[PDB]
Amino acid sequence: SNLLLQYGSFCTQLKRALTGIAVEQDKNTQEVFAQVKQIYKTPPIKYFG
Amino acid sequence: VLTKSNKKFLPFQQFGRDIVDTTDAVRDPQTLEILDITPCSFGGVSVITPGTNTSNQVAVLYQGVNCTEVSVAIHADQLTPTWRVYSTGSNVFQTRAGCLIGAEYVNNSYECDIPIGAGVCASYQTSQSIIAYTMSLGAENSVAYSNNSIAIPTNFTISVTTEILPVSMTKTSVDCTMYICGDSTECSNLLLQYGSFCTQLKRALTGIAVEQDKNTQEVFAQVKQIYKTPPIKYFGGFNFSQILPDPSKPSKRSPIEDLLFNKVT
Amino acid sequence: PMQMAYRFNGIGVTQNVLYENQKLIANQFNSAIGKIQDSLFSTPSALGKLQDVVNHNAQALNTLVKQLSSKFGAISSVLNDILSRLDPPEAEVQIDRLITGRLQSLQTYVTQQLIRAAEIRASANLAATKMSECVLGQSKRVDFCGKGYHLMSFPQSAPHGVVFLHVTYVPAQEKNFTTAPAICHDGKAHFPREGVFVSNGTHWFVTQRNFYEPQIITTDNTFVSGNCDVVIGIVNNTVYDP
Amino acid sequence: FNGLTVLPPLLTDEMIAQYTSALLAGTITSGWTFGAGPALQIPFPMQMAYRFNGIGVTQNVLYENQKLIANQFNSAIGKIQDSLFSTPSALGKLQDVVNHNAQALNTLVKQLSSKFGAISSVLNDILSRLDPPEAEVQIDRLITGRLQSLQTYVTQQLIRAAEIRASANLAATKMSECVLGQSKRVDFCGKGY
Ligand SMILES: *[C@@H]1O[C@H](CO)[C@@H](O[C@@H]2O[C@H](CO)[C@@H](O[C@@H]3O[C@H](CO)[C@@H](O)[C@H](O)[C@@H]3O)[C@H](O)[C@H]2NC(C)=O)[C@H](O)[C@H]1NC(C)=O
Ligand SMILES: *[C@@H]1O[C@H](CO)[C@@H](O[C@@H]2O[C@H](CO)[C@@H](O)[C@H](O)[C@H]2NC(C)=O)[C@H](O)[C@H]1NC(C)=O
Ligand SMILES: *[C@@H]1O[C@H](CO)[C@@H](O[C@@H]2O[C@H](CO)[C@@H](O)[C@H](O)[C@H]2NC(C)=O)[C@H](O)[C@H]1NC(C)=O
Ligand SMILES: *[C@@H]1O[C@H](CO)[C@@H](O)[C@H](O)[C@H]1NC(C)=O
Ligand SMILES: *[C@@H]1O[C@H](CO)[C@@H](O)[C@H](O)[C@H]1NC(C)=O
Numbered sequence A: 001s002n003l004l005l006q007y008g009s010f011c012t013q014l015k016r017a018l019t020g021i022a023v024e025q026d027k028n029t030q031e032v033f034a035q036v037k038q039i040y041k042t043p044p045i046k047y048f049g
Numbered sequence B: 001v002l003t004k005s006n007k008k009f010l011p012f013q014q015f016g017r018d019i020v021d022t023t024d025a026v027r028d029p030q031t032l033e034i035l036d037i038t039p040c041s042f043g044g045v046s047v048i049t050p051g052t053n054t055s056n057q058v059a060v061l062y063q064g065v066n067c068t069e070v071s072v073a074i075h076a077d078q079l080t081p082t083w084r085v086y087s088t089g090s091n092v093f094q095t096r097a098g099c100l101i102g103a104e105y106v107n108n109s110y111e112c113d114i115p116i117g118a119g120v121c122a123s124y125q126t127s128q129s130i131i132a133y134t135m136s137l138g139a140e141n142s143v144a145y146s147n148n149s150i151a152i153p154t155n156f157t158i159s160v161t162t163e164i165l166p167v168s169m170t171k172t173s174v175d176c177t178m179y180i181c182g183d184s185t186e187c188s189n190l191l192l193q194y195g196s197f198c199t200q201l202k203r204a205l206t207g208i209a210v211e212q213d214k215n216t217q218e219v220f221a222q223v224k225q226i227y228k229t230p231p232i233k234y235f236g237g238f239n240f241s242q243i244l245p246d247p248s249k250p251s252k253r254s255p256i257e258d259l260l261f262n263k264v265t
Numbered sequence C: 001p002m003q004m005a006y007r008f009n010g011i012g013v014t015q016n017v018l019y020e021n022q023k024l025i026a027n028q029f030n031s032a033i034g035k036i037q038d039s040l041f042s043t044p045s046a047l048g049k050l051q052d053v054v055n056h057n058a059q060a061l062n063t064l065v066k067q068l069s070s071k072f073g074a075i076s077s078v079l080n081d082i083l084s085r086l087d088p089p090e091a092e093v094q095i096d097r098l099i100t101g102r103l104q105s106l107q108t109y110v111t112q113q114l115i116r117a118a119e120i121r122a123s124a125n126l127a128a129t130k131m132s133e134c135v136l137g138q139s140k141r142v143d144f145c146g147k148g149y150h151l152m153s154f155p156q157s158a159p160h161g162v163v164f165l166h167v168t169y170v171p172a173q174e175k176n177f178t179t180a181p182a183i184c185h186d187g188k189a190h191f192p193r194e195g196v197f198v199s200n201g202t203h204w205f206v207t208q209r210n211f212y213e214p215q216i217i218t219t220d221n222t223f224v225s226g227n228c229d230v231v232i233g234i235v236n237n238t239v240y241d242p
Numbered sequence D: 001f002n003g004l005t006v007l008p009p010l011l012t013d014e015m016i017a018q019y020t021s022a023l024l025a026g027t028i029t030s031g032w033t034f035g036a037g038p039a040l041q042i043p044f045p046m047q048m049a050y051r052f053n054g055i056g057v058t059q060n061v062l063y064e065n066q067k068l069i070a071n072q073f074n075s076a077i078g079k080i081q082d083s084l085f086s087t088p089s090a091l092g093k094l095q096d097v098v099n100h101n102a103q104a105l106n107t108l109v110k111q112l113s114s115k116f117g118a119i120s121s122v123l124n125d126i127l128s129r130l131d132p133p134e135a136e137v138q139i140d141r142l143i144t145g146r147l148q149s150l151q152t153y154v155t156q157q158l159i160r161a162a163e164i165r166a167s168a169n170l171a172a173t174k175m176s177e178c179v180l181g182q183s184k185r186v187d188f189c190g191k192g193y
């Protein structure tokens, strides 16, 4: 670890990039699926024509 | 950790290996018993805070460990954050994301404030402290469907919404000679042997630079000619003064444009 | 006002509504535009996606200039001392080490810049499409130029980006009614031309589909097709002839 | 497991199922009107008549052919299950993502056992065999190799996340235009009107 300390700030950028991907995934799912405001319930499933 | 196993080794084998390389199993040379090797628990020690301007209390989320182990290792000393634990009691909750210390699990449900993981979010509510709960997806509204029922609106609302989009980024250029071999005549000769990395770095930067101007030209220059509004008069009652240019200040922008330019730094 | 009458006609609502509610519509538009300024000003984290670009570029530059102080497993981090402390061979070795490290730093920076430039290019193409379809025209695509039916869009400049103000139409104050697909008058079924059949309990009317405006059923509002034995929910009322 | 951790999604599978149920209920009970304001109820045959008007066919075609259209729709839904189950290589695009992620992780965990021009891939063997002078050189070699490996992994992950983001944007547009309304764009919400 002491020798690795001399190589600079590679680790902080690697961690930041990975966290960026991680939050982006949840953002993608929320954008695709959370398009409705209120949860709508089907009636007693009945004659739909 | 060396636990008891049930793998059936062959009499001439010593170790065991997984699908990649790792020594999953081992055989003790004396008692001749299979022993499974499982690695020590490790992970993140993430921190939940409501805001220093609001309070100072915190919660700590250990990722992917059984609360039991944490507590076990909290007792004695095995953990390595070395925080003397952020305050224990009826405040150790076990969620699918991990082990949460510093918040209490309520049975309520409302809109998420600070995501944690799985359905579990956290917030700061009322004395007031940090609580954790299961996310609520919104209210339940059963529409009165029927064979002969219809609904028709009787009024309307005109709404104005805002959308924000990036168009361009800063253009940067970098010189190898000044960056790597700063003002040294003995370093440049030792850079010519590494090839032509610098020319392609400069080419990439120049390409980004010209693309930045192409973006702005494509987005904004969609009008062949510049149009000017008349001496502003009755548009039917619609005001428009907040978006049109105001010829009473430098840079000829509009009030909303001024606010946008005075909030981004 | 004629332009907004055309806009209204493009979402399904007739021209009567605008000319008969001009004052109300103008007041609503003025109040909305007024509230926009306060909504932008009060909330600090509104222009956030625009701030992220500047922050990321600053961070990239700052890390690039911070790694210049890294030693990369050499004697020191300055060329002058390494030159004026030891022999030419070990000098070559140390300079080779530092050169390799700094080339790696530049490569990382340039690759990251290329990826972010690709993302911003995608965003810019999306912005150009929105400008072409919501500002130079009217869009029928759902939830593309705003939540609700589309009327207008106005652009505004911003540091390194654009802000679109979308003006949209949202219905409100609904009311329940009884419907019927067709009406049989003289043995032949009548279907509406542009509206739906409603009834408040006693009488039957034909209306639009986005704003209540009852009208009496007449032969210039309905068209006939076939007898009355094949449709399911057919009621029996009168179709007057003017 | 050598420092690599997999984090769970924010939205569990039950929650996504509940969104999907809500969207389906809104479509079947309210029509296209729940994406542009408050939801208003409408009978299903009238909604289908409105859609036929939207594609350029008059209303008479629907109401005088209700049973036939209902039967065709039911048969199509029935055959969808058999078509999906019979072909094994149907959901290949989704399987490609998980396969590529597994390959990337496995390559990363395998590259720990490469000598990378050192004495051995086990650091403990390196330390308790030779002096600090040569130990510095060997450790530096291993560090450079593994740093390069990590950099490659992260760059590949970013490049693939870009494509996944593009696909997610396309899916959002399809949900907003195809499901919350009717599309006049050709070959966007199917092969046909
Ligand atoms: C909308 O129309 C449908 C027509 O299909 C109505 O549903 C039908 O309702 C009747 C009773 O009102 C059901 O009859 C019952 O059938 C069972 C069969 O086992 C029988 O045991 C009972 O004695 C009775 O005859 C009929 O099955 C049902 N059909 C379907 C497919 O749902 C529905 O009630 C109407 N909705 C409204 C708005 O009233
Ligand atoms: C358009 O809206 C603005 C915002 O309210 C109006 O501006 C105010 O007008 C009053 C009366 O002239 C002035 O006393 C205020 O100082 C104005 N405020 C601002 C923001 O400068 C403006 O008058 C409206 N335009 C019209 C034609 O009525
Ligand atoms: C349904 O709407 C019609 C609108 O024409 C109502 O009819 C009129 O109602 C007023 C009520 O004061 C009477 O004075 C008129 O004589 C009615 N005219 C007609 C056409 O008969 C009708 O009453 C409404 N019914 C319900 C149940 O609301
Ligand atoms: C954690 O340990 C307890 C103790 O037996 C066990 O019941 C439980 O299944 C384990 N797993 C988790 C994470 O809950
Ligand atoms: C429509 O809404 C406006 C604003 O709320 C109100 O002033 C007006 O009276 C309403 N009209 C009807 C028909 O309810």
Ligand SMILES: *[C@@H]1O[C@H](CO)[C@@H](O)[C@H](O)[C@H]1NC(C)=O
Residues within 6 Å of the ligand: C184, C185, C186, C187, C235, C236, C237
């Ligand atoms: C209308 O419907 C009623 C009930 O089905 C029927 O008795 C009558 O003959 C029909 N014809 C008309 C238009 O009155």
